[PDB]
């Protein structure tokens, strides 16, 4: 297979620092890039959670999360889920982290939320959207008011599926921590392997970002991606930012010189992407 050549960025004093302005433009136009993991941020507990959560109460300290199914939350989409592909997941929105996750996992989630916030604001500035529209345009993610899922993934190599079939993420921005081969992206109609680099996150955009920016100078895309069939197990985890969803408003497209036009609801966007994706 092809291997994607990705731009690398780091968080600095003025948001995202790519190598130069040209690289930033390639990165945002491709819809995927690498983000250097801050040296102070500890990912070891998250890594361990992704390796354990599916294993049940015999396995300490995280296997017990296997038992918190969807029926424990009111929200069908949270807790432990076996998927149709090799993937199984544990997903939790931020309003539940403090009560439900281990304290050190909630900490990791909070750090990733603030890191994702900085990345998103750097992207919004590059899109030419006026700053006073950012909070509504981002469904709260330009501050700390969005919906945030910290989601743990395990690929059951004993299952005869693709690892995770082709899809685009919901939401605005995904910060993905992966340390093993498997992720593939359809950059320019060709499937390419994402090179492994455990010192970087993989960052891409979701469908809400694509809708938002479709009329800008450089429309941004929610990149189609998948995880190939795994012959041996694999795990990963990701931080996913989407619009606030308190039972108000919904999903916007930015029109240069005019402001924000509502396209649909927060609800209808996720439930509709759940199927054909
Ligand atoms: O596990 C991976 O590398 C990708 C996971 C992913 O694409 C997702 O959870 O939406
Ligand atoms: Cl299982
Ligand atoms: Cl399966
Ligand atoms: Fe994804």
PDB file of C-alpha atoms and ligand atoms in Angstrom:
ATOM      1  CA  UNK A   1       0.000   0.000   0.000  1.00  0.00           C
ATOM      2  CA  UNK A   2       0.808   3.698  -0.287  1.00  0.00           C
ATOM      3  CA  UNK A   3       1.961   5.508   2.856  1.00  0.00           C
ATOM      4  CA  UNK A   4       0.630   9.016   3.423  1.00  0.00           C
ATOM      5  CA  UNK A   5       3.104  11.871   3.752  1.00  0.00           C
ATOM      6  CA  UNK A   6       1.614  14.007   6.524  1.00  0.00           C
ATOM      7  CA  UNK A   7       2.578  17.467   7.702  1.00  0.00           C
ATOM      8  CA  UNK A   8       3.657  17.695  11.348  1.00  0.00           C
ATOM      9  CA  UNK A   9       2.688  20.516  13.708  1.00  0.00           C
ATOM     10  CA  UNK A  10       3.206  21.396  17.365  1.00  0.00           C
ATOM     11  CA  UNK A  11       1.303  23.593  19.786  1.00  0.00           C
ATOM     12  CA  UNK A  12       3.188  26.835  20.384  1.00  0.00           C
ATOM     13  CA  UNK A  13       2.645  30.417  21.501  1.00  0.00           C
ATOM     14  CA  UNK A  14       0.400  31.386  18.596  1.00  0.00           C
ATOM     15  CA  UNK A  15      -1.567  28.188  18.127  1.00  0.00           C
ATOM     16  CA  UNK A  16      -0.427  25.586  15.618  1.00  0.00           C
ATOM     17  CA  UNK A  17       3.148  25.914  14.353  1.00  0.00           C
ATOM     18  CA  UNK A  18       3.651  24.033  11.108  1.00  0.00           C
ATOM     19  CA  UNK A  19       7.051  24.267   9.383  1.00  0.00           C
ATOM     20  CA  UNK A  20       5.799  27.279   7.393  1.00  0.00           C
ATOM     21  CA  UNK A  21       2.577  28.762   6.048  1.00  0.00           C
ATOM     22  CA  UNK A  22       2.646  26.466   3.016  1.00  0.00           C
ATOM     23  CA  UNK A  23       2.738  23.325   5.175  1.00  0.00           C
ATOM     24  CA  UNK A  24      -0.203  24.535   7.283  1.00  0.00           C
ATOM     25  CA  UNK A  25      -2.193  25.045   4.092  1.00  0.00           C
ATOM     26  CA  UNK A  26      -1.378  21.553   2.828  1.00  0.00           C
ATOM     27  CA  UNK A  27      -2.275  20.072   6.226  1.00  0.00           C
ATOM     28  CA  UNK A  28      -5.656  21.758   6.554  1.00  0.00           C
ATOM     29  CA  UNK A  29      -6.426  21.052   2.892  1.00  0.00           C
ATOM     30  CA  UNK A  30      -5.583  17.357   3.230  1.00  0.00           C
ATOM     31  CA  UNK A  31      -7.781  17.154   6.337  1.00  0.00           C
ATOM     32  CA  UNK A  32      -5.246  15.170   8.400  1.00  0.00           C
ATOM     33  CA  UNK A  33      -1.879  15.874  10.016  1.00  0.00           C
ATOM     34  CA  UNK A  34       0.353  14.901  12.895  1.00  0.00           C
ATOM     35  CA  UNK A  35       0.468  16.860  16.153  1.00  0.00           C
ATOM     36  CA  UNK A  36       3.461  16.541  18.456  1.00  0.00           C
ATOM     37  CA  UNK A  37       2.439  15.166  21.870  1.00  0.00           C
ATOM     38  CA  UNK A  38       3.534  17.627  24.583  1.00  0.00           C
ATOM     39  CA  UNK A  39       6.408  16.121  26.518  1.00  0.00           C
ATOM     40  CA  UNK A  40       4.679  16.785  29.881  1.00  0.00           C
ATOM     41  CA  UNK A  41       1.470  14.901  28.988  1.00  0.00           C
ATOM     42  CA  UNK A  42       1.302  11.344  30.317  1.00  0.00           C
ATOM     43  CA  UNK A  43      -0.587   8.907  28.050  1.00  0.00           C
ATOM     44  CA  UNK A  44       0.347   5.726  29.899  1.00  0.00           C
ATOM     45  CA  UNK A  45      -2.942   5.390  31.821  1.00  0.00           C
ATOM     46  CA  UNK A  46      -4.954   5.967  28.660  1.00  0.00           C
ATOM     47  CA  UNK A  47      -2.809   3.410  26.823  1.00  0.00           C
ATOM     48  CA  UNK A  48      -3.455   0.883  29.608  1.00  0.00           C
ATOM     49  CA  UNK A  49      -7.208   1.641  29.612  1.00  0.00           C
ATOM     50  CA  UNK A  50      -7.387   0.917  25.866  1.00  0.00           C
ATOM     51  CA  UNK A  51      -5.644  -2.439  26.432  1.00  0.00           C
ATOM     52  CA  UNK A  52      -7.899  -3.470  29.354  1.00  0.00           C
ATOM     53  CA  UNK A  53     -11.394  -2.015  29.234  1.00  0.00           C
ATOM     54  CA  UNK A  54     -12.949  -4.942  27.314  1.00  0.00           C
ATOM     55  CA  UNK A  55     -11.586  -7.684  29.593  1.00  0.00           C
ATOM     56  CA  UNK A  56     -14.087  -7.578  32.512  1.00  0.00           C
ATOM     57  CA  UNK A  57     -13.886  -7.320  36.304  1.00  0.00           C
ATOM     58  CA  UNK A  58     -11.113  -9.878  36.683  1.00  0.00           C
ATOM     59  CA  UNK A  59      -8.517  -7.500  35.184  1.00  0.00           C
ATOM     60  CA  UNK A  60      -7.318  -4.523  37.253  1.00  0.00           C
ATOM     61  CA  UNK A  61      -7.665  -1.582  37.231  1.00  0.00           C
ATOM     62  CA  UNK A  62      -9.781  -0.994  34.110  1.00  0.00           C
ATOM     63  CA  UNK A  63     -11.346  -4.286  32.944  1.00  0.00           C
ATOM     64  CA  UNK A  64     -14.507  -3.617  34.945  1.00  0.00           C
ATOM     65  CA  UNK A  65     -15.588  -0.949  32.425  1.00  0.00           C
ATOM     66  CA  UNK A  66     -16.669  -3.835  30.152  1.00  0.00           C
ATOM     67  CA  UNK A  67     -19.714  -4.182  32.385  1.00  0.00           C
ATOM     68  CA  UNK A  68     -21.010  -0.591  31.989  1.00  0.00           C
ATOM     69  CA  UNK A  69     -23.258  -1.123  28.972  1.00  0.00           C
ATOM     70  CA  UNK A  70     -25.424   1.436  27.178  1.00  0.00           C
ATOM     71  CA  UNK A  71     -28.382   0.833  29.518  1.00  0.00           C
ATOM     72  CA  UNK A  72     -26.431   2.437  32.399  1.00  0.00           C
ATOM     73  CA  UNK A  73     -26.382   5.958  30.948  1.00  0.00           C
ATOM     74  CA  UNK A  74     -29.700   7.025  29.398  1.00  0.00           C
ATOM     75  CA  UNK A  75     -27.630   7.924  26.331  1.00  0.00           C
ATOM     76  CA  UNK A  76     -27.682   4.888  24.023  1.00  0.00           C
ATOM     77  CA  UNK A  77     -24.285   5.782  22.586  1.00  0.00           C
ATOM     78  CA  UNK A  78     -22.195   5.670  25.792  1.00  0.00           C
ATOM     79  CA  UNK A  79     -20.504   2.864  27.721  1.00  0.00           C
ATOM     80  CA  UNK A  80     -19.202  -0.424  26.305  1.00  0.00           C
ATOM     81  CA  UNK A  81     -20.193  -1.330  22.711  1.00  0.00           C
ATOM     82  CA  UNK A  82     -19.273  -4.317  20.549  1.00  0.00           C
ATOM     83  CA  UNK A  83     -19.290  -3.168  16.906  1.00  0.00           C
ATOM     84  CA  UNK A  84     -19.934  -5.153  13.717  1.00  0.00           C
ATOM     85  CA  UNK A  85     -16.290  -4.837  12.601  1.00  0.00           C
ATOM     86  CA  UNK A  86     -13.351  -6.093  14.680  1.00  0.00           C
ATOM     87  CA  UNK A  87     -13.683  -2.956  16.838  1.00  0.00           C
ATOM     88  CA  UNK A  88     -15.149  -2.829  20.340  1.00  0.00           C
ATOM     89  CA  UNK A  89     -15.288   0.490  22.205  1.00  0.00           C
ATOM     90  CA  UNK A  90     -15.855   2.276  25.472  1.00  0.00           C
ATOM     91  CA  UNK A  91     -17.219   5.807  24.848  1.00  0.00           C
ATOM     92  CA  UNK A  92     -18.001   8.472  27.420  1.00  0.00           C
ATOM     93  CA  UNK A  93     -19.070  12.122  27.125  1.00  0.00           C
ATOM     94  CA  UNK A  94     -17.349  14.713  29.349  1.00  0.00           C
ATOM     95  CA  UNK A  95     -20.360  15.286  31.592  1.00  0.00           C
ATOM     96  CA  UNK A  96     -19.791  11.743  32.931  1.00  0.00           C
ATOM     97  CA  UNK A  97     -15.975  11.668  33.172  1.00  0.00           C
ATOM     98  CA  UNK A  98     -15.671  12.879  36.764  1.00  0.00           C
ATOM     99  CA  UNK A  99     -18.312  10.474  38.075  1.00  0.00           C
ATOM    100  CA  UNK A 100     -17.639   7.388  35.914  1.00  0.00           C
ATOM    101  CA  UNK A 101     -14.041   7.334  34.657  1.00  0.00           C
ATOM    102  CA  UNK A 102     -11.056   6.660  36.904  1.00  0.00           C
ATOM    103  CA  UNK A 103      -9.777  10.020  38.143  1.00  0.00           C
ATOM    104  CA  UNK A 104      -6.572   9.770  36.060  1.00  0.00           C
ATOM    105  CA  UNK A 105      -8.580   9.008  32.901  1.00  0.00           C
ATOM    106  CA  UNK A 106     -10.797  12.066  33.491  1.00  0.00           C
ATOM    107  CA  UNK A 107      -7.608  14.119  33.888  1.00  0.00           C
ATOM    108  CA  UNK A 108      -6.339  12.835  30.552  1.00  0.00           C
ATOM    109  CA  UNK A 109      -9.676  13.718  28.994  1.00  0.00           C
ATOM    110  CA  UNK A 110      -9.573  17.261  30.397  1.00  0.00           C
ATOM    111  CA  UNK A 111      -6.020  17.826  29.096  1.00  0.00           C
ATOM    112  CA  UNK A 112      -7.007  16.573  25.668  1.00  0.00           C
ATOM    113  CA  UNK A 113     -10.059  18.860  25.686  1.00  0.00           C
ATOM    114  CA  UNK A 114      -7.853  21.919  26.260  1.00  0.00           C
ATOM    115  CA  UNK A 115      -5.337  20.737  23.667  1.00  0.00           C
ATOM    116  CA  UNK A 116      -8.160  20.163  21.163  1.00  0.00           C
ATOM    117  CA  UNK A 117      -9.587  23.601  21.994  1.00  0.00           C
ATOM    118  CA  UNK A 118      -6.291  25.258  21.060  1.00  0.00           C
ATOM    119  CA  UNK A 119      -6.095  23.324  17.773  1.00  0.00           C
ATOM    120  CA  UNK A 120      -9.697  24.131  16.828  1.00  0.00           C
ATOM    121  CA  UNK A 121      -9.282  27.865  17.415  1.00  0.00           C
ATOM    122  CA  UNK A 122      -6.183  27.863  15.227  1.00  0.00           C
ATOM    123  CA  UNK A 123      -8.216  26.205  12.442  1.00  0.00           C
ATOM    124  CA  UNK A 124     -11.162  28.596  12.808  1.00  0.00           C
ATOM    125  CA  UNK A 125      -8.897  31.624  12.476  1.00  0.00           C
ATOM    126  CA  UNK A 126      -7.418  30.236   9.260  1.00  0.00           C
ATOM    127  CA  UNK A 127     -10.948  29.838   7.860  1.00  0.00           C
ATOM    128  CA  UNK A 128     -11.728  33.571   7.831  1.00  0.00           C
ATOM    129  CA  UNK A 129     -14.693  33.272  10.202  1.00  0.00           C
ATOM    130  CA  UNK A 130     -15.130  36.312  12.522  1.00  0.00           C
ATOM    131  CA  UNK A 131     -14.184  35.520  16.104  1.00  0.00           C
ATOM    132  CA  UNK A 132     -17.491  36.583  17.587  1.00  0.00           C
ATOM    133  CA  UNK A 133     -19.217  33.844  15.549  1.00  0.00           C
ATOM    134  CA  UNK A 134     -16.853  31.057  16.712  1.00  0.00           C
ATOM    135  CA  UNK A 135     -18.792  29.913  19.782  1.00  0.00           C
ATOM    136  CA  UNK A 136     -22.048  29.386  17.920  1.00  0.00           C
ATOM    137  CA  UNK A 137     -20.305  28.076  14.790  1.00  0.00           C
ATOM    138  CA  UNK A 138     -18.353  25.479  16.809  1.00  0.00           C
ATOM    139  CA  UNK A 139     -21.275  24.438  19.022  1.00  0.00           C
ATOM    140  CA  UNK A 140     -19.273  25.634  22.013  1.00  0.00           C
ATOM    141  CA  UNK A 141     -15.998  23.949  21.079  1.00  0.00           C
ATOM    142  CA  UNK A 142     -14.191  27.263  20.507  1.00  0.00           C
ATOM    143  CA  UNK A 143     -14.480  27.609  24.297  1.00  0.00           C
ATOM    144  CA  UNK A 144     -15.031  24.582  26.626  1.00  0.00           C
ATOM    145  CA  UNK A 145     -18.790  24.267  26.066  1.00  0.00           C
ATOM    146  CA  UNK A 146     -18.842  21.582  23.370  1.00  0.00           C
ATOM    147  CA  UNK A 147     -19.646  17.885  23.557  1.00  0.00           C
ATOM    148  CA  UNK A 148     -16.487  15.825  24.081  1.00  0.00           C
ATOM    149  CA  UNK A 149     -16.139  12.071  23.870  1.00  0.00           C
ATOM    150  CA  UNK A 150     -13.071  10.272  25.152  1.00  0.00           C
ATOM    151  CA  UNK A 151     -13.343   6.938  23.375  1.00  0.00           C
ATOM    152  CA  UNK A 152     -11.229   3.777  23.796  1.00  0.00           C
ATOM    153  CA  UNK A 153     -10.842   1.278  20.930  1.00  0.00           C
ATOM    154  CA  UNK A 154      -9.812  -2.378  20.861  1.00  0.00           C
ATOM    155  CA  UNK A 155      -9.589  -4.435  17.627  1.00  0.00           C
ATOM    156  CA  UNK A 156     -10.421  -8.123  18.153  1.00  0.00           C
ATOM    157  CA  UNK A 157      -8.083  -9.834  15.702  1.00  0.00           C
ATOM    158  CA  UNK A 158     -10.016 -13.090  16.230  1.00  0.00           C
ATOM    159  CA  UNK A 159     -12.959 -11.535  14.351  1.00  0.00           C
ATOM    160  CA  UNK A 160     -12.978 -11.917  10.536  1.00  0.00           C
ATOM    161  CA  UNK A 161     -13.892  -8.318   9.764  1.00  0.00           C
ATOM    162  CA  UNK A 162     -12.197  -5.194   8.556  1.00  0.00           C
ATOM    163  CA  UNK A 163     -10.912  -3.459  11.702  1.00  0.00           C
ATOM    164  CA  UNK A 164     -13.256  -0.497  11.305  1.00  0.00           C
ATOM    165  CA  UNK A 165     -14.978   0.206   8.044  1.00  0.00           C
ATOM    166  CA  UNK A 166     -14.696   3.419   6.012  1.00  0.00           C
ATOM    167  CA  UNK A 167     -16.254   6.432   7.668  1.00  0.00           C
ATOM    168  CA  UNK A 168     -16.007  10.138   8.364  1.00  0.00           C
ATOM    169  CA  UNK A 169     -16.049  11.326  11.977  1.00  0.00           C
ATOM    170  CA  UNK A 170     -18.937  13.303  13.385  1.00  0.00           C
ATOM    171  CA  UNK A 171     -18.125  16.554  15.046  1.00  0.00           C
ATOM    172  CA  UNK A 172     -15.420  19.122  14.451  1.00  0.00           C
ATOM    173  CA  UNK A 173     -12.044  17.756  15.444  1.00  0.00           C
ATOM    174  CA  UNK A 174     -10.626  14.363  16.381  1.00  0.00           C
ATOM    175  CA  UNK A 175      -7.373  13.958  18.299  1.00  0.00           C
ATOM    176  CA  UNK A 176      -6.305  10.314  17.860  1.00  0.00           C
ATOM    177  CA  UNK A 177      -3.659   8.467  19.867  1.00  0.00           C
ATOM    178  CA  UNK A 178      -2.487   5.434  17.915  1.00  0.00           C
ATOM    179  CA  UNK A 179       0.781   3.506  18.273  1.00  0.00           C
ATOM    180  CA  UNK A 180       0.392   0.619  15.788  1.00  0.00           C
ATOM    181  CA  UNK A 181      -0.200   0.195  12.073  1.00  0.00           C
ATOM    182  CA  UNK A 182      -3.733  -0.027  10.752  1.00  0.00           C
ATOM    183  CA  UNK A 183      -5.135   3.424  10.160  1.00  0.00           C
ATOM    184  CA  UNK A 184      -5.698   4.255   6.492  1.00  0.00           C
ATOM    185  CA  UNK A 185      -6.928   7.465   4.901  1.00  0.00           C
ATOM    186  CA  UNK A 186      -8.412   8.253   1.512  1.00  0.00           C
ATOM    187  CA  UNK A 187      -6.581  11.547   0.951  1.00  0.00           C
ATOM    188  CA  UNK A 188      -6.976  11.987  -2.826  1.00  0.00           C
ATOM    189  CA  UNK A 189      -9.120   8.986  -3.862  1.00  0.00           C
ATOM    190  CA  UNK A 190      -6.289   6.577  -3.051  1.00  0.00           C
ATOM    191  CA  UNK A 191      -6.182   4.632   0.199  1.00  0.00           C
ATOM    192  CA  UNK A 192      -2.945   5.237   2.060  1.00  0.00           C
ATOM    193  CA  UNK A 193      -1.480   3.959   5.308  1.00  0.00           C
ATOM    194  CA  UNK A 194      -0.958   6.537   8.038  1.00  0.00           C
ATOM    195  CA  UNK A 195       2.645   6.131   9.212  1.00  0.00           C
ATOM    196  CA  UNK A 196       3.109   5.120  12.835  1.00  0.00           C
ATOM    197  CA  UNK A 197       4.605   7.710  15.193  1.00  0.00           C
ATOM    198  CA  UNK A 198       3.857   7.279  18.922  1.00  0.00           C
ATOM    199  CA  UNK A 199       5.234  10.784  19.633  1.00  0.00           C
ATOM    200  CA  UNK A 200       2.383  12.413  17.656  1.00  0.00           C
ATOM    201  CA  UNK A 201      -1.354  12.436  17.657  1.00  0.00           C
ATOM    202  CA  UNK A 202      -3.239  12.109  14.419  1.00  0.00           C
ATOM    203  CA  UNK A 203      -5.620  15.047  13.933  1.00  0.00           C
ATOM    204  CA  UNK A 204      -8.509  15.135  11.474  1.00  0.00           C
ATOM    205  CA  UNK A 205     -11.846  16.901  11.085  1.00  0.00           C
ATOM    206  CA  UNK A 206     -15.423  15.681  11.322  1.00  0.00           C
ATOM    207  CA  UNK A 207     -18.597  16.221   9.349  1.00  0.00           C
ATOM    208  CA  UNK A 208     -19.592  19.296  11.375  1.00  0.00           C
ATOM    209  CA  UNK A 209     -16.333  21.016  10.336  1.00  0.00           C
ATOM    210  CA  UNK A 210     -16.864  20.166   6.684  1.00  0.00           C
ATOM    211  CA  UNK A 211     -20.403  21.572   6.777  1.00  0.00           C
ATOM    212  CA  UNK A 212     -19.217  24.669   8.632  1.00  0.00           C
ATOM    213  CA  UNK A 213     -16.443  25.567   6.189  1.00  0.00           C
ATOM    214  CA  UNK A 214     -17.945  24.496   2.857  1.00  0.00           C
ATOM    215  CA  UNK A 215     -18.133  28.117   1.580  1.00  0.00           C
ATOM    216  CA  UNK A 216     -14.740  29.366   2.811  1.00  0.00           C
ATOM    217  CA  UNK A 217     -11.686  30.053   0.641  1.00  0.00           C
ATOM    218  CA  UNK A 218     -10.323  26.606   1.546  1.00  0.00           C
ATOM    219  CA  UNK A 219     -13.237  24.326   2.463  1.00  0.00           C
ATOM    220  CA  UNK A 220     -12.077  21.711   4.945  1.00  0.00           C
ATOM    221  CA  UNK A 221     -13.029  18.066   4.564  1.00  0.00           C
ATOM    222  CA  UNK A 222     -13.904  15.265   6.973  1.00  0.00           C
ATOM    223  CA  UNK A 223     -11.440  12.708   5.659  1.00  0.00           C
ATOM    224  CA  UNK A 224     -12.651   9.197   4.955  1.00  0.00           C
ATOM    225  CA  UNK A 225     -10.650   6.680   6.954  1.00  0.00           C
ATOM    226  CA  UNK A 226     -10.703   3.077   8.146  1.00  0.00           C
ATOM    227  CA  UNK A 227      -8.683   0.516  10.100  1.00  0.00           C
ATOM    228  CA  UNK A 228      -7.528  -2.486   8.079  1.00  0.00           C
ATOM    229  CA  UNK A 229      -8.205  -6.056   9.187  1.00  0.00           C
ATOM    230  CA  UNK A 230      -5.934  -6.765  12.152  1.00  0.00           C
ATOM    231  CA  UNK A 231      -4.112 -10.098  12.337  1.00  0.00           C
ATOM    232  CA  UNK A 232      -3.026  -9.371  15.904  1.00  0.00           C
ATOM    233  CA  UNK A 233      -4.781  -7.195  18.425  1.00  0.00           C
ATOM    234  CA  UNK A 234      -4.572  -3.406  18.296  1.00  0.00           C
ATOM    235  CA  UNK A 235      -5.810  -0.608  20.512  1.00  0.00           C
ATOM    236  CA  UNK A 236      -6.074   3.172  20.337  1.00  0.00           C
ATOM    237  CA  UNK A 237      -8.038   6.019  21.825  1.00  0.00           C
ATOM    238  CA  UNK A 238      -9.348   9.360  20.657  1.00  0.00           C
ATOM    239  CA  UNK A 239     -10.804  12.665  21.832  1.00  0.00           C
ATOM    240  CA  UNK A 240     -13.783  13.783  19.732  1.00  0.00           C
ATOM    241  CA  UNK A 241     -15.231  17.323  19.780  1.00  0.00           C
ATOM    242  CA  UNK A 242     -18.795  18.021  18.553  1.00  0.00           C
ATOM    243  CA  UNK A 243     -21.644  20.480  19.195  1.00  0.00           C
ATOM    244  CA  UNK A 244     -23.203  20.932  22.622  1.00  0.00           C
ATOM    245  CA  UNK A 245     -26.509  19.038  22.817  1.00  0.00           C
ATOM    246  CA  UNK A 246     -28.570  20.209  25.813  1.00  0.00           C
ATOM    247  CA  UNK A 247     -32.357  19.551  25.595  1.00  0.00           C
ATOM    248  CA  UNK A 248     -31.766  24.919  21.833  1.00  0.00           C
ATOM    249  CA  UNK A 249     -29.808  24.957  18.560  1.00  0.00           C
ATOM    250  CA  UNK A 250     -27.862  22.951  16.017  1.00  0.00           C
ATOM    251  CA  UNK A 251     -25.474  22.813  13.070  1.00  0.00           C
ATOM    252  CA  UNK A 252     -24.234  25.789  11.043  1.00  0.00           C
ATOM    253  CA  UNK A 253     -22.680  26.724   7.733  1.00  0.00           C
ATOM    254  CA  UNK A 254     -20.672  29.945   7.580  1.00  0.00           C
ATOM    255  CA  UNK A 255     -21.532  32.279   4.692  1.00  0.00           C
ATOM    256  CA  UNK A 256     -18.766  34.851   4.052  1.00  0.00           C
ATOM    257  CA  UNK A 257     -20.080  38.412   4.580  1.00  0.00           C
ATOM    258  CA  UNK A 258     -23.374  37.104   6.078  1.00  0.00           C
ATOM    259  CA  UNK A 259     -22.738  34.977   9.166  1.00  0.00           C
ATOM    260  CA  UNK A 260     -24.107  31.584  10.145  1.00  0.00           C
ATOM    261  CA  UNK A 261     -26.920  29.674   8.468  1.00  0.00           C
ATOM    262  CA  UNK A 262     -28.470  26.764  10.368  1.00  0.00           C
ATOM    263  CA  UNK A 263     -28.342  23.539   8.351  1.00  0.00           C
ATOM    264  CA  UNK A 264     -29.886  20.909  10.679  1.00  0.00           C
ATOM    265  CA  UNK A 265     -29.907  19.771  14.305  1.00  0.00           C
ATOM    266  CA  UNK A 266     -27.174  18.339  16.501  1.00  0.00           C
ATOM    267  CA  UNK A 267     -29.286  15.176  16.769  1.00  0.00           C
ATOM    268  CA  UNK A 268     -30.078  14.546  13.095  1.00  0.00           C
ATOM    269  CA  UNK A 269     -26.409  14.817  12.084  1.00  0.00           C
ATOM    270  CA  UNK A 270     -24.987  12.054  14.296  1.00  0.00           C
ATOM    271  CA  UNK A 271     -27.889   9.619  13.880  1.00  0.00           C
ATOM    272  CA  UNK A 272     -27.737   9.987  10.090  1.00  0.00           C
ATOM    273  CA  UNK A 273     -23.969   9.538   9.903  1.00  0.00           C
ATOM    274  CA  UNK A 274     -24.308   6.438  12.121  1.00  0.00           C
ATOM    275  CA  UNK A 275     -25.694   4.411   9.200  1.00  0.00           C
ATOM    276  CA  UNK A 276     -24.106   4.908   5.716  1.00  0.00           C
ATOM    277  CA  UNK A 277     -20.607   5.402   7.346  1.00  0.00           C
TER     278      UNK A 277
HETATM  279  O1  LIG B   1      -8.377   3.236  15.906  1.00  0.00           O
HETATM  280  C1  LIG B   1      -8.088   4.062  15.004  1.00  0.00           C
HETATM  281  O2  LIG B   1      -6.914   4.215  14.613  1.00  0.00           O
HETATM  282  C2  LIG B   1      -9.155   4.920  14.350  1.00  0.00           C
HETATM  283  C3  LIG B   1     -10.443   4.953  15.163  1.00  0.00           C
HETATM  284  C4  LIG B   1     -11.497   5.825  14.514  1.00  0.00           C
HETATM  285  O3  LIG B   1     -11.364   6.131  13.333  1.00  0.00           O
HETATM  286  C5  LIG B   1     -12.667   6.248  15.280  1.00  0.00           C
HETATM  287  O4  LIG B   1     -12.792   5.846  16.465  1.00  0.00           O
HETATM  288  O5  LIG B   1     -13.553   6.982  14.769  1.00  0.00           O
HETATM  289 CL1  LIG B   2     -15.862  -9.758  22.911  1.00  0.00          CL
HETATM  290 CL1  LIG B   3     -17.334  -8.232  15.142  1.00  0.00          CL
HETATM  291 FE1  LIG B   4     -12.744   7.784  12.874  1.00  0.00          FE
END
